[PDB]
Amino acid sequence: ANINKLRESGNAEYRKQRYGDAIKLYTLGLQMALTRPAWEPAGLVRDEIHQLYSNRAQAYMQLGQWPEAAADAECSVEAKRQGNAKAWYRRGKCLMEMRRLQEAREWVARGLEFEEEKELAELLKEIDSKLAAEKASRDAHDNPTVEEVD
Amino acid sequence: VNPKRSANINKLRESGNAEYRKQRYGDAIKLYTLGLQMALTRPAWEPAGLVRDEIHQLYSNRAQAYMQLGQWPEAAADAECSVEAKRQGNAKAWYRRGKCLMEMRRLQEAREWVARGLEFEGEEKELAELLKEIDSKLAAEKASRDAHPTVEEVD
Hints:
2 copies of one chain form a homodimer.
Chain A (H helix, E strand, L loop, with lengths): L2 H13 L3 H16 L8 H20 L3 H14 L5 H13 L3 H14 L2 H26 L8
Helix pairs in contact in A: 1-2, 1-3, 2-3, 3-4, 3-5, 4-5, 5-6, 5-7, 6-7
């Protein structure tokens, strides 16, 4: 599992803000992870893959492209469902930036059931706050059936 | 001017709604109650038809009138009876009880009720908007309880 090395190299490039190169190194790590024969034990490389996906998602976000990052984050969560709060966060935020608020809400709400609520929970709070903002505008737009009696 | 049970019950309900729209809520409640008496005194060996249809409507209506007087428990029971009389196509009843449980500081019960209601009768927004509200309120609450500092002190 010397793929760790590659991740670290990518990690280096991440701090230098040259995120593209970090993406490439993370990607190489992933390929070195995914090209193992099917009959090799998979867990060792499992943890590493959750890490590689999460980190590549963050770099991708720094580049401002959300679909890729959401995908990567989701793969990270699929490789590690619990203990991986950052990945939950990143997919949530991506969904928010893609104006996909409801699904973001669902996602974070799930993540929190698993976990650290601090990062995630303010993220969630912010999500249903934004949601409130929309609901308000929707009412004003056309100007109450619930009170009405049939 | 039918001799039928249904038309007189219906009359009762319309009177109730009229008094409701004039914001005479107590009178509306008494009329709805009369209507429910006419509906419920129908013998078992009678056709459980258009008379039995009036029940979910009377209950939902009286629940609303109760909510206009801040009387949440009563309304909650009425709405529950309405939903019992009619699962699907009765979004207002589900809703009304949902809000009643909300006002009675019983959030999880309302949450489950609203969700169940959602499957059970609709895919319709209003229930869902209320549900979203319930979840926001839950989260915030458990935030203050769970979170529990010098600036905060007063001098």
